[PDB]
Design a protein around this ligand. Structure first.
Ligand code: HEM
Ligand code: DYC
Length: 370
């Protein structure tokens, strides 16, 4: 893969994310570096209205314009949601809303916190010579002390890295179908399933680094957005850029490319059917980095791996393709049980609509067996 922005060690994650902005943007990072306290003390919101509108002409490289997208997104959620107790701002100050919107249209992303910001670009290594383990990693920004933002953002990022071992096989899968090497394709399909069989064990780390009550009551509030939300029934006013209020969806892992790139690979038509679940995942491709959004396009253009395995009558190929699909069904089933412990049960002490979305997705993945 070339120019699709896919590292081979971390995958869709941003490799070596930049931690510090230039000196010119010291007013921004100081606000973002100290979000837990500026929110509790009620100082944040005024300190955004007391900002001087800066210019993005001094963010040059890729890793700057991404971290600035991470900084102005963490700030925007804190301004809009405040302490996370219902008090909602409907207007975003123009001295920060303009450079955010200026930077978004440069990266073809929407002006809101997305999966690619606080998961894929929000990380670093403690010791830069030790492996990618939860113990050697940390996040760049949090929202509130005790929000379990580290365990949430990082366990998701570690799954994104276990999937990288399977994405470097994708070119060898398509080559083996054009040059027609059945034995090479079977090796590839079995290797992909093995990588997805190992990623399921990374999902277990969520139980030692995230709290149910602190995720439901606290963290889920700051990752929310303004789209069909009664708290901003019309949307958010981005002062300076649009005279109209705009609606953008909140933080969702439907913007994640890992589990989508395999549905596209294995021919699972998750994005067809005109349902609420099929609609949601296609819309969330606009919240994806344009290179990752284009890599998924190139996968949907290549010939189907399903319509190839099904056309040869090869009991060895069918059982390997089912190994890939059964690996996805297990991941999503474990993921479903996590939402039960972390959303449904806490809400019993809004969610049913969400757990139905995953069951629709898990079932479609499971109907694609052979
Ligand atoms: C406490 C932990 C977790 C909770 C409560 C949770 C919750 C949810 C919910 C409610 C949805 C559907 C609504 C939405 O998209 O916002 C979802 C979707 C999704 N989440 Fe999670 N999740 C957790 C952990 C993870 C992790 C660690 C990953 C790692 C990649 C992940 C990946 C995904 C994906 C790919 C989807 C899209 C559905 C699919 O493609 O199957 N989730 N999650
Ligand atoms: Br913004 C943002 C959007 C999504 C996530 C995320 C990682 S895993 C997971 N399940 C549901 C959401 N989600 C984290 C930050």
């Amino acid at each position: 893969s070339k120019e699709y922005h896919i590292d081979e060690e971390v995958g869709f994650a941003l490799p070596n994310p930049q931690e510090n902005l230039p000196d010119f943007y010291n007013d921004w990072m100081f606000i973002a570096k100290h979000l837990p306290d500026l929110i509790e003390s009620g100082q944040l919101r005024e300190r955004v209205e007391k900002l001087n509108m800066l210019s993005i002409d001094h963010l040059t490289d890729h890793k700057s314009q991404r971290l600035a997208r991470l900084v102005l997104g963490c700030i925007t959620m804190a301004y809009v949601w405040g302490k996370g107790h219902g008090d909602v701002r409907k207007v975003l100050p123009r001295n920060i809303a303009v450079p955010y919107c200026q930077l978004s249209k440069k990266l073809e992303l929407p002006p809101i916190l997305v999966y690619a910001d606080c998961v894929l670009a929000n990380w670093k290594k403690k010791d830069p010579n030790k492996p990618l383990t939860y113990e050697n990693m940390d996040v760049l920004f949090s929202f509130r002390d005790g929000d379990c933002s580290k365990g949430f953002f990082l366990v998701s990022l570690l799954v994104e890295i276990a999937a990288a071992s399977a994405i470097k096989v994708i070119p060898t899968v398509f080559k083996a179908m054009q040059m027609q090497e059945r034995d090479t394709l079977l090796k590839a399909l079995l290797e992909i399933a093995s990588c997805l069989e190992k990623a399921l064990q990374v999902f277990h780390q969520i139980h030692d680094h995230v709290n149910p009550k602190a995720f439901f009551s606290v963290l889920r509030i700051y990752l929310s957005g303004w789209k069909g939300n009664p708290q901003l029934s019309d949307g958010l006013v981005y002062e300076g850029f649009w005279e109209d209020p705009k609606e953008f969806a909140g933080g969702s892992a439907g913007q994640s490319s890992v589990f989508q790139c395999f549905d596209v690979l294995l021919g699972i038509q998750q994005t067809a059917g005109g349902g609420h679940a099929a609609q949601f995942l296609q819309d969330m491709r606009r919240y994806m980095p344009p290179a990752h959004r284009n890599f998924l396009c190139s996968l949907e253009s290549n010939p189907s791996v399903r319509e190839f395995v099904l056309s040869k009558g090869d009991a060895g190929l069918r059982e390997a393709y089912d190994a890939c699909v059964k690996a996805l069904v297990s991941l999503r089933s474990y993921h479903l049980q996590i939402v039960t412990k972390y959303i449904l049960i806490p809400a019993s002490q809004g969610g049913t609509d969400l757990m139905n979305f995953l069951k629709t997705v898990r079932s479609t993945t499971e109907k694609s067996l052979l």
